[PDB]
């Protein structure tokens, strides 16, 4: 999916809240790293002034977090409102032959789900994605600032992740939809057996229908199983790389930051 759908989604919010969200997130993550950066200097030993500065940073963090959360909430609600109203208005002014041409399922279905789905899950998932990506960038910057040379070692591995990204999505999407399909005729089948139960017990066709249901539940399980297998694959490989990076970081920190740099407040942040 291109950046155009998200661009329209966020431009429906307006310029008023876009920056209010983005800069607030950036500042919250900067505070969350700076508190530990100052704790690093706190460690080695004006302890009272140090602790007071730590308290100030701790307060800034929570205030900024509350602000960001309220921003995401308000923006998501406004976007849902405007999108629903615009959809209704644009559907109102359509010609009759358009309504006769398009089936009712598609026109009704967007309002039935798309609207519901967005309201239920887009704000929370967007917030989680933003927090995750900014926390990852912050952690990379931390382990770079701690050990400079470690930076130059981490850009190779990250490029590896790029290749792990593509091959994942182009399958993870696919399997996903397959699951949905194997869920749809199964349930429906159940209902068909319940209503015409007398006819089916009369024809003595119970065996063939049980065969059909075993077939359907197998087709459901193979999909819901390959999906979890692929998720495990991506998980394990990304984790192996996430362990390679900490190995290399610690191996560079023990030598560079002790033998030559002789600075102890560094290795703490990097390892953590």
């Amino acid at each position: 999916i291109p950046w155009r759908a998200c661009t329209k989604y966020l431009s429906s919010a307006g310029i008023l809240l876009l920056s209010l969200l983005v800069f607030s997130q950036l500042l919250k993550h900067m505070v969350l790293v700076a508190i530990d950066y100052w704790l690093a200097k706190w460690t080695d030993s004006d302890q009272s002034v140090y602790a007071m500065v730590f308290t100030l940073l701790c307060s800034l963090g929570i205030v900024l977090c509350l602000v960001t959360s309220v921003t995401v909430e308000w923006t998501g609600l406004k976007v849902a409102k405007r999108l629903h109203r615009s959809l209704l208005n644009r559907i109102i002014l359509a010609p009759m032959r358009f309504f006769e041409t398009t089936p009712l399922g598609s026109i009704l279905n967007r309002f039935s789900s798309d609207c519901n789905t967005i309201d239920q899950h887009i704000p929370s998932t967007l917030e989680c994605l933003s927090r995750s990506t900014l926390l990852c960038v912050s952690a990379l910057t931390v382990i770079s600032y701690v050990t400079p040379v470690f930076l130059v070692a981490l850009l190779p591995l990250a490029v590896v992740c790029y290749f792990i990204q593509k091959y994942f999505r182009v399958a993870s999407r696919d399997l996903q939809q397959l699951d949905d399909t194997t869920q749809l005729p199964l349930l429906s089948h159940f209902a068909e057996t319940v209503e015409g139960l007398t006819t089916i017990r009369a024809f003595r066709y119970e065996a063939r229908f049980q065969q059909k249901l075993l077939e359907y539940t197998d087709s459901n399980n193979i999909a819901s199983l390959f999906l979890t297998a692929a998720n495990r694959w991506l998980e394990v490989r990304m984790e192996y790389i996430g362990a390679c990076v900490v190995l290399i970081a610690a191996a560079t920190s023990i030598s560079n930051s002790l033998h030559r740099e002789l600075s102890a407040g560094l290795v703490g942040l990097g390892l953590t």
Binding site: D44, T55, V72, G76, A223, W233, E239, A251
Partner: protein, 538 residues
């Protein structure tokens, strides 16, 4: 003659690494045959890998090349033994196995000589562990020749490679791969690479093994239900499921607890490294690497085994309640909707609860180890901090409940809106023939405002959840560090203490959220199984 015995140990690794290369190069230039002790062999080989890392650590501490070469040679020898065993699993032979057995015997002899010469006078423990591992691998090889045909009488009476997972086109081969790939999912490389190019479909997908079908799980479940009902209910069906799904679930749970232990262990070696440099650290770094990879691998294997047990259970109880649908009476509209909800929400609740079952056993040990570990690093002050984080777990649950309530209300409004739409999108020509459409759009917008009003409270609760999520990590460190140094004992807080506390705070925040969802899922699953029992027994 220490160097003499070191060389005598170096020799057999060299012998094996030299015989492996012709065969490995011929093999490098679709029936899987498994042998008894395969999984034991791979487990022991990983233990050998670990002990060899320790030997390399000893050799670094001592340094004299010839004194630490034996470890570097046994490393390649064990990797080449793995390569041999892969080449034998792919194509069976009676001779390659003897080729392994010779090397095992000679390595055992050399290790015995080392042990004797040491007894006559850290090294002791490592050498002993290697001796025990090589001996157990020798016994495995003796078992393998005892089984089929190392030399034994004429014909192997060989198995006839398993057709369950290897006969006619199947694509999901989980039970039929090398016990390393059973952990690291290496068999998915081919699938995912082919999937990148050609779009996947049911013709491009496999078929489920005989180990997991509707028939297999239904058979096991009905056998357990039979053995329990012949001794005659909700508790009955529960115990039946328990005894029917048995070993897999507890295996997943113990994988999970061992992973939790190693995860609690990581930050302590971090602490040790931080201490050492401020005042024996490369060893701790490589140990941290090994422990991270092993902990996460075990965690993932645990997840997968639990998920597969859950999928089995879903298939089983689904085909069972369909078998019950055949014998029910006609006197029992509302029952049809209740039946199809009994398959669409109740069964999914059951299966997701079976997903989260091992987490419910592994959470308490995790929080207990966390609190006891942080107490011994920060002292009494730690306890105070250990309260705050824990206090987030019940509160979270409360928040969740509120969400649910809100959800219900919202859903109601939503449903009504849909009704007021279904008319407009059907009387289209009627509607536009006199342009009464705006009059109905006003009513539709009137419903929408009520829907919007509900959503505000829901998103407020979501905001409170996200806020607490990152507020409690900050508050723990705040009220702990300020309450430790400038409050209680003015103890000098070395960087190690603070950073280990930070690590443990994150490693404890991650599991805490899951306990709330686990409790909700468990109570909902209990209610759904009561419902399933009430239905299945009418």
């Amino acid at each position: 003659n220490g160097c003499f015995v070191d060389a005598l140990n170096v020799v057999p690794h060299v012998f094996l690494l030299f015989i492996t290369f012709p065969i490995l190069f011929i093999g490098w230039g679709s029936t899987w045959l498994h042998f008894p002790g395969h999984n034991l062999r791979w487990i022991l080989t990983f233990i050998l890998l670990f002990v060899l890392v320790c030997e390399i650590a000893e050799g670094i501490l001592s340094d004299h090349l010839h004194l630490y070469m034996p470890a570097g040679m046994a490393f390649m020898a064990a990797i080449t033994s793995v390569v041999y065993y892969h080449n034998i699993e792919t194509s069976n032979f009676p001779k390659l196995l003897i080729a392994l057995l010779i090397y095992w015997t000679l390595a055992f002899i050399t290790k015995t000589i080392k042990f004797v010469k040491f007894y006559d006078h850290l090294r002791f423990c490592l050498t002993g562990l290697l001796v025990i591992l090589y001996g157990m691998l020798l016994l495995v090889e003796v078992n393998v020749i005892r089984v089929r045909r190392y030399i034994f009488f004429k014909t192997p009476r060989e198995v006839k490679p398993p057709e369950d997972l290897q006969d006619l086109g199947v694509r999901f081969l989980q039970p039929f791969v090398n016990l390393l790939s059973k952990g690291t999912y290496w068999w998915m490389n081919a699938f995912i690479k082919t999937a990148h190019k050609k779009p996947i479909d049911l013709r491009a997908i496999g078929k489920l093994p005989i180990a997991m079908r509707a028939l297999t799980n239904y058979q096991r479940l009905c056998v357990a239900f039979d053995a329990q009902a012949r001794k005659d209910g909700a508790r009955a069906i529960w115990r039946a499921l328990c005894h029917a799904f048995g070993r897999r679930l507890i295996l997943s749970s113990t994988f999970r607890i061992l992973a939790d232990l190693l995860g609690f262990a990581g930050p302590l070696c971090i602490f040790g490294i931080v201490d050492h440099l401020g005042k024996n650290a490369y060893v701790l770094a490589v140990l941290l690497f090994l422990a991270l990879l092993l902990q996460r691998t075990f965690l993932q294997a645990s997840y997968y085994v639990a998920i597969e047990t859950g999928i089995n259970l879903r298939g089983a109880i689904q085909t069972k309640i369909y078998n019950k649908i055949m014998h029910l009476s006609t006197s029992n509209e509302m029952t049809a909707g209740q039946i199809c909800n009994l398959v669409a929400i109740d069964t999914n609740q059951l299966m997701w609860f079976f997903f989260l079952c091992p987490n419910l056993w592994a959470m308490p040990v995790q929080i207990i180890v966390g609190v006891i570990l942080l107490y011994y690093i920060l002292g009494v002050s730690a306890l105070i901090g250990a309260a705050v984080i824990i206090l987030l777990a019940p509160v979270q649950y409360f928040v969740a409940t509120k969400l649910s309530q809100a959800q219900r209300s919202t859903l109601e409004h939503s449903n009504e809106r849909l009704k007021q739409t279904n008319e407009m999108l059907r009387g289209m020509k009627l509607l536009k023939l006199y342009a009464w459409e705006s009059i109905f759009c006003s009513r539709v917008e009137v419903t929408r405002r009520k829907e919007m009003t509900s959503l505000r409270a829901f998103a407020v609760y979501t905001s409170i959840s996200i806020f607490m999520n990152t507020a409690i990590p900050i508050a723990a460190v705040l009220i702990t560090f300020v309450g430790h140094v400038s409050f209680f004992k003015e103890s000098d807080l070395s960087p190690s203490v603070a950073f280990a506390s930070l690590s443990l705070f994150h490693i404890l925040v991650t599991p805490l959220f899951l306990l709330s969802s686990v409790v909700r899922s468990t109570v909902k699953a209990l209610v759904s199984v009561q419902k399933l029992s009430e239905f299945l027994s009418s």
